[PDB]
Design a protein around this ligand. Structure first.
Ligand SMILES: CC(C)S[C@@H]1O[C@H](CO)[C@H](O)[C@H](O)[C@H]1O
Ligand SMILES: CC(C)S[C@@H]1O[C@H](CO)[C@H](O)[C@H](O)[C@H]1O
Ligand SMILES: CC(C)S[C@@H]1O[C@H](CO)[C@H](O)[C@H](O)[C@H]1O
Ligand SMILES: CC(C)S[C@@H]1O[C@H](CO)[C@H](O)[C@H](O)[C@H]1O
Ligand code: NA
Ligand code: NA
Ligand code: NA
Ligand code: NA
Ligand code: NA
Ligand code: NA
Ligand code: NA
Ligand code: NA
Lengths: 989, 989
């Protein structure tokens, strides 16, 4: 019975249910005057493909390193050519049999040589702030211990092992371990030592841990301060000095500061402080805030707050989980610049440096533990680590390290147990551990809807309808009356909503109106802040983002990792510009007569004093009037009516009919803040004098008949097809009805509920909307006016194998300068296919012009795209962009770039300019066809063909959020219908 | 109100509901002594893309031909580079709005100049035997008329238009017309003048039409003869001479021939005859047969017959609908050579020349009218031409021309109204017209299950179960008692069954047993005889077949056109070799003791006198005994027991135990027939003395342990994986469990019935069966025998994200020469995924050898492939083939080539030979992996990689016919289970 398998001991440790061994007690991450040496830099790295063939050849000693090579540390090592990134959403990339690991399991051996001066003696520790997923640590050949909890910190005492002068630190990192079963976040699998490695001296009579407690009495204005300090687990004597408040006190004792300025996301007041013992001093930033739940409302400092949140992953398109500090600071400023006031650290603690930046810049943080067992759901949660008693110690350790590290930061207003981990005994243990350790912060966890072990009711992607019922407290009761009573007394948060994947998210405004109406609604956190795109260079040297499957994954989830409000390089998607407007903290309703505007202060604490209120009147020629208006400060949750200067109203009263003019009132920062320069726009409102309807040209030019062509003023028609073949010299290669668009990511998600759950994209393909064909029925010229005639072209549009159709009639007219086009659309037969109604993407026309377009200008909404349930950030005005800037650089190309609400448009096709006017239409211009757009999986797949594809839509459907959560709301769907609409066209040179 | 559209008159004719105009009355195709001149050859051809731009430039006159070019006539013109073939199954390739045609509609102008001598004067006609789909005919500028009914003949009188000497014939052919709506057969859309164009003189006092009536009185042996002859529609005087029967009689009168030899498919007796008037004589072949329906049985000449049928389309891989006569004769001989006795002309009349060949070679023909409106089904049959009164005249014309052309041929035993045309008034009119015109043949039509207007109950792809209930007369009743009484008194035919697409068809034997058991079952016609592959040459110059979508179709149905028993070049698929055995007309059951065989004559008319009965005993060394045995003729439907020579039994009694020997009794043709040479095999039976079970080698060699390898006799194992890395010097690159195979066409069809209707291929992908992974659990060496040891390798196989698995244990043993491998498979967890049980394709092993294989030999079933529900044609014996001949050249590559029931196998890998033995296993060898097989859409996509992929299966599931009709029958499914099996391996040089 001889056992002959290799590497059984390494594998048995990888399969362990326990937390890491050998590490010091979890504590706060603290800024200390103690000596420190960062071991970051260039290490040596050897990759082996599994435990059984990973060499046990004394490499830890740093001598005779066969097969090592330079690798930066911190790193996610697939980002540097060792293996590849792999992306899964829910599915595990290995067989599900906890706690066992697959045979293919990348093992990365890391090694670094450093110098330890006398200041690291006699006592020092090594601190690892994150290793994915299983680390074993040797120092000078001696085993220190192991790490479990990939985004949690570990510290190992090196006293009596660290030698003066030169030392050799060695770390073996296994990508997969039993811990992988509890780290199934929807993101790239990325092994490595991806956070700081640090040597820290531990002088005697020092401070190991500190627990700040800084409450605020909103009735008295008092701060309630107690700073606890400990060493070796024991409360020690230390002095706490807070200069700004005239405070010297002893650690351990609670005092009442007579008057403090409270901390909030709006006003992040931070008092500098220091706690010190004989051998060590620790610098703190203290924010006085108290969190309370009463009347089913989540309150900070005595006021219900509104969360304007995003879910923040840590991703970098070239460095993986390594986010450089400048990228962190820049992205939180970007968040502030878009009215965001809350962050959820989905779904693991962030880099320890993040916390101070959130304290300073001002965000309400939901700090989330590193726990997700989502992959067990598909088996009915069988073997779920969250309910398996053998994982209890591991999971409690995760919560402990999570809480201890960040417990001092005012910005953390909730602890979260994890994400989509099911329900189970171990989550209850983590809750009980947290409530006892830190009763000052409510506990969040969406995964158990009964809310038995949490303090707030949390859901993800609940529909607008259900959110409205919850806001009113009338959602259906829980079976357990006692649990139901508790949950009904909780405030409600959407930890994830308006999935921001691709074109979208639609429906954001309907959520926001409910957040404002019902105090029990705490708000929501958009899923998610960034796309996880990974930069890839094609053979030519062209950059684009790759996603799941682009890196050879056997199982993957494609572009579901690119679902953000900004791309991986933090460039805004249109959804972010819309989101900023949706969550703007002030509401400005400009009066129709331009005499004033209503101003509501939607903030919770600040008044309007930080803002300058600016107005401008813009017409076709440019700005006609503008200035600033003084507003006596408006209190939070109050409103007033601000008179505008009489010149504005007078200008409006004197406008001729049909002359367009736009009045915009903007609230901008009066002075530089920590997160934007003075004049930065925070909120806005407008009132528009719309251009009158266009006048059809007089039908005075007649139809000139030839053998194979017909001419009506500037329009040449092919007599065979009845379609225009050129307009004013601009060649027209095709004109026809459109009812379809290249499916968005939302259109590829399943239409849940009811008997038909085919995605909308599939419903459309089945129906043939992408392959319409047109039969000509007749061409008549008819008596117009004083010798002129109109031309009517009758057609029927359908698709192969379908009996349903639309009759489309084009009536053309011209006076020689303007072309008038009336289009009439009539349903023919019932638009049902495979048993279910067909819905349309649009009702419009596609002009394929035989010239390229360089510039597109329009009067309408802009500058960015807008669909019926989006475009809140698009304002009324005059806009002009080069063609390439009309498009949107989504990683998977899809329908985008329509400008809804357009009244006029001008395309510069070289020397000539094509001017389109008419009743409100949506405008899109591209250098490639819808089939080239739909076929493209990445942006280099789009190819220009030298034509101009011009879309003029009389109707559009919304974009919704069906990739995850609600589809298009009822009022934005587009069922087949009859339609009619007028355009004017004119070509200029 | 001026109308300006182009080509409205051409289009209005294309949209016409009427049959062609201007043609002479439909008549029989008759062999006449009248002068004839075939206008086949090289014509001139111009293609325009639609009616509106097709030139009206006097081209019919043959002068100034701008844009014409040589094109053979007959032709399907896409086959010669003008446009492309397009394939749809059910869906129309144009919008469904009868009778309107699409704007893109290929218009082919045809022109030929010919010479008409004095023998074509004063009277001649032009005959067109098929134009797809709308022809307009001019002769010397004068319009003759138009053609509707693409596979029906038209004749135009050219008296006074044909000029002596030189004439110019011009034909405009439109691909699409209103007729397209009633010609929706599942096949290539192929416009052209695809059948003969002929000039025929019509001398005075001639014969226009002839209607032969040749009945058989099976009680008296009398023939019942009446030959009708007409001219200009009127019964004329003509003399009928049948030399062989001593007959001279007048046309028009019925006589009783005292004794005739009756015609049947088994014995196609044809009497030569001639009917003549003053100016013309017509040669006929007369077969005396009477068709009757009684006692719910379809009888010919007094006996119920059994139809052994195929559905025959007309297709040629380079000429489209043009089938050269030599290909026709060769393919019907091939049919006879495979025991086929019946043909259904799916779904249109064949070339007129086909009928005489079926009379002569001997087939029961279902002659089917050119009518199919299948594309209307998806709209609930709305606007179905079969029930639209405006199509009545068109549809009756189709039936009339169909019946008139072929009414004289004994082989036509049923008229068919068409195929999948729904139900409607117009089908009733076609039935009433046929029953009145020709009461001597029953009417067939599957589309109306109530059978109101037919004489036989026909169905397609009814399950074995339902066929069994119908055979017993206990199928559920129709709602109308009167209609139910009629249908229950009808015999039952499967006009289509055992869909022969790709690997398959399975389940054929279960149908055949029912056809034999129940007299009401008439038999069935396999769908279908040939694949419609179109030869295509890749850039390299490599040939393969293309199918739907390979020719740029916008809508298509892929490889559903390659669903035949033979490929387009008439090379048999394995399904044909199986089918021939299934329908063999004699049953030979060889006795277990080898003393004799039971012989049942399954024919309906012939005895066994045409057959020589041959026996042979084959052993490992070759033939041991053989000869012929005399059998007193057995009557139809009788049986006897034929003694074999005592030497055979004695040989069997003297065989040592475990020595394999096979006794085969064959019925071969004693003498050359019209369709095969003497000795051609018609039926066979076998009795097998199976080799005893293999003896595991003695476990006397021990396990030699090294650092990274283990050696057990000739086997080297990698110590890391526990898997063999070489066996006797043959490198082993991988060994593991298989549970999956590259989906067949059947596995891609939906599993109808129940809550899960995902295709089996999809069920497997969802379950991860194609991406199994293996974790190593342990490697133990254990005490064997006299110093030797066995090696056990314990593994678990699963897939990423799945909790279910199988434990697989390999126990190896060797005495130095033979390697013994015991494999044990144990289910771990419930194999359920997405709510439904997972089923396996197989339980086996995959050896990936690092050398190429040149030759594969085995003892088992062969020579061709066999799966649990197929392989009837594979007999027991010893077989040996070069590797490339183990594969099957299906147009879409898919699982094929397994040899089930194997007892031993030998692979020649260069110099060395790998010998596998064990209990019954299935054997497959390929030069490429299953993923290369599954990914390949065409055969050039398969790529060899220099390895050998060896599959040894302990269990396989059946292949069924789920691409159309029943899936795998219950007894051949493969639910997960525990299994264990032993192999021996041995390498030789
Ligand atoms: C073929 C181009 C005109 S498509 C063009 O490519 C660019 C990348 O260079 C951007 O991705 C644009 O969004 C895209 O429109
Ligand atoms: C199968 C999905 C509905 S689960 C859904 O996937 C999303 C993908 O972005 C998010 O990650 C959500 O957290 C998750 O609930
Ligand atoms: C890459 C080859 C070994 S696959 C090989 O190709 C042949 C065509 O040349 C045949 O189609 C065989 O069936 C196929 O196995
Ligand atoms: C949708 C199918 C089940 S219809 C099915 O298609 C087959 C394809 O070979 C055959 O042509 C049959 O005639 C037809 O009934
Ligand atoms: Na949502
Ligand atoms: Na995602
Ligand atoms: Na589009
Ligand atoms: Na655009
Ligand atoms: Na069948
Ligand atoms: Na088919
Ligand atoms: Na296969
Ligand atoms: Na094979």
């Amino acid at each position: 019975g001889r056992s002959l398998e290799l590497g059984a001991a390494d594998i048995q440790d990888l399969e362990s249910f326990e937390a890491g061994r050998g590490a010091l007690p979890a504590r706060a991450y603290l800024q200390s005057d103690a000596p420190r040496l960062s071991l970051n830099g260039e290490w040596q790295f050897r990759l082996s493909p599994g435990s059984r063939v990973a060499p046990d050849d004394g490499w830890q000693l740093g001598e005779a390193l066969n097969g090592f090579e330079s690798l930066p540390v911190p790193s996610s090592w697939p980002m540097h050519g060792h293996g590849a990134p792999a992306y899964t959403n829910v599915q595990f990339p290995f067989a599900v049999e906890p706690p066992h690991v697959p045979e293919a399991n990348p093992i990365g051996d890391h090694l670094v040589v450093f110098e330890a001066g006398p200041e690291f003696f006699p006592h020092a520790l090594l601190r690892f702030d994150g290793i994915e997923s299983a680390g074993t640590v040797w120092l000078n050949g001696v085993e220190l211990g192991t790490t479990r909890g990939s985004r949690l910190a570990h510290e190992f005492d090196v006293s009596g092992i660290l030698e003066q002068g030169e030392n050799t630190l060695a770390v073996r990192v296994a990508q997969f371990s039993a811990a992988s079963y509890v780290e199934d976040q929807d993101m790239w699998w990325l092994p490595g030592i991806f956070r700081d490695v640090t040597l820290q001296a531990r002088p005697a009579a020092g401070i190991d841990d500190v627990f700040v407690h800084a409450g605020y009495d909103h009735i008295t204005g008092e701060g309630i301060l107690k700073v606890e300090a400990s060493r070796g687990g024991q409360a020690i004597d230390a002095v706490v000095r807070v200069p700004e408040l005239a405070l010297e006190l002893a650690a351990g004792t609670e005092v009442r500061v007579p008057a403090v300025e409270p901390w909030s996301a709006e006003v992040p007041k931070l008092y500098e402080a220091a706690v010190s013992a004989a051998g060590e001093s620790v610098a703190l930033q203290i924010g006085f805030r108290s969190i309370a739940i009463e009347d089913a409302q989540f309150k900070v400092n005595g006021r219900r707050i509104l969360l304007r949140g995003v879910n923040r992953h840590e991703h970098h398109p070239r460095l993986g989980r390594v986010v450089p500090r400048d990228v962190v600071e820049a992205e939180l400023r970007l968040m502030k610049q878009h009215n965001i006031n809350a962050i959820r650290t989905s779904h693991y603690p962030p880099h320890p440096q993040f916390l101070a930046l959130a304290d300073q810049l001002g965000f309400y943080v939901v700090l989330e533990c590193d726990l997700e067992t989502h992959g067990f759901e598909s088996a009915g949660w069988a073997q779920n680590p969250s309910d398996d008693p053998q994982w209890e110690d591991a999971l409690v350790d995760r919560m402990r390290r999570t809480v201890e590290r960040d417990k001092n930061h005012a910005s953390v207003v909730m602890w979260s147990l994890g994400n989509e981990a099911g329900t189970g005994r171990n989550l209850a243990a983590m809750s009980r551990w947290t409530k006892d350790r830190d009763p000052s912060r409510p506990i969040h966890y969406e995964g158990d809807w009964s809310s038995e072990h949490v303090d707030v009711y949390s859901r993800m992607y609940a529909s607008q309808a259900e959110t409205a019922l919850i806001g009113q407290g009338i959602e259906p009761a829980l079976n357990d009356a006692a649990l139901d009573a508790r949950r009904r007394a909780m405030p409600f948060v959407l930890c994830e909503y308006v999935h921001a994947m691709g074109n979208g998210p639609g429906g954001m405004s309907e959520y926001q109106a409910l957040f404002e109406k019902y105090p029990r609604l705490m708000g929501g956190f958009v899923w998610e802040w960034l796309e996880h795109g990974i930069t890839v260079s094609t053979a030519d040297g062209v950059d684009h983002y790759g996603y799941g499957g682009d890196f050879g994954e056997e199982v993957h989830d494609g572009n579901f990792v690119t679902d953000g409000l900004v791309d991986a390089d933090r460039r805004p998607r249109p959804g972010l510009l819309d989101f900023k407007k949706v969550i703007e903290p002030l509401r400005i309703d400009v009066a129709r007569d331009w005499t004033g505007f209503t101003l509501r202060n939607g903030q919770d604490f600040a008044d309007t004093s930080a803002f300058s209120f600016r107005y401008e009147v813009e017409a076709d020629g440019g700005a006609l009037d503008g200035g600033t208006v003084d507003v006596a400060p408006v209190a939070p949750q109050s409103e007033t009516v601000v008179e505008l200067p009489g010149s504005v109203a007078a200008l409006a009263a004197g406008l001729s009919d049909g002359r367009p003019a736009v009045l915009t009132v903007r609230a901008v920062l009066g002075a530089d803040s920590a997160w934007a320069d003075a004049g930065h726009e925070v909120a806005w409102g407008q009132s528009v004098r719309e251009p009158g309807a266009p006048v059809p040209p007089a039908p005075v030019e007649p139809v000139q008949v030839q053998d194979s062509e017909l001419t009506l003023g500037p329009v040449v028609f092919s007599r065979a097809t009845g379609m225009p073949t050129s307009i004013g010299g601009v060649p027209v290669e095709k004109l026809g009805l459109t009812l379809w668009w290249a499916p968005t990511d939302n259109d590829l998600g399943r239409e849940w509920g009811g008997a038909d759950e085919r995605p909308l994209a599939t419903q459309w393909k089945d129906a043939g909307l992408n392959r319409l064909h047109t039969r000509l029925l007749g061409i008549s010229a008819n008596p117009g006016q004083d010798g002129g005639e109109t031309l009517t072209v009758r057609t029927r549009v359908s698709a192969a194998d379908k009996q349903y159709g639309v009759l489309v009639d084009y009536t053309w007219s011209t006076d020689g300068e303007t072309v008038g086009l009336r289009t009439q659309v009539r349903r023919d037969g019932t638009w049902v296919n495979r048993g279910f109604e067909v819905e349309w993407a649009r009702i419009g026309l596609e002009f394929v012009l035989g010239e390229e377009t360089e510039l597109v200008s329009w009067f309408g909404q802009g500058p960015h795209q807008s669909y019926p349930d989006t475009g809140q950030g698009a304002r009324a005005g005059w806009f002009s962009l080069p063609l390439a800037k009309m498009d949107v650089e989504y990683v998977r190309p899809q329908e985008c770039g329509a400008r809804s609400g357009s009244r006029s448009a001008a395309l510069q096709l070289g020397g000539r300019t094509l001017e389109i006017c008419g009743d409100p239409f949506a405008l899109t211009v591209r250098p490639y066809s819808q089939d080239v757009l739909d076929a493209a999986a990445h942006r280099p797949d789009l190819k220009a063909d030298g034509r101009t594809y011009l879309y003029v839509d009389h109707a559009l459907r919304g974009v919704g959020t069906a990739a995850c959560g609600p589809g298009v709301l009822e009022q934005y769907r587009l069922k087949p219908r009859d339609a009619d609409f007028i355009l004017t066209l004119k070509v200029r040179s």
